Amino acid sequence: KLLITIHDRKEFAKFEEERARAKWDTANNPLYKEATSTFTNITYRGT
């Protein structure tokens, strides 16, 4: 469902990510965001 969760990741997940990455930064996120690794500078940073 990952192919589809991307869209809900920015919509929904961004919500949970606030508290999620607040406690499980390394569990939910690989660095900060996902696009932080594959890209160098992006405004969404998770696009």
Q: How was this structure determined?
A: NMR
Check: CB of residue 10 under 8 Å from CB of residue 46.
yes
φ, ψ of residue 34 to 5 degrees: the values are -85, -40
- Decide: 4 and 11 in contact? Cβ < 8 Å: no
Q: Residue 1 gets which letter from DSSP?
A: -
Helices (H), the chain: 2-8, 14-28, 35-38
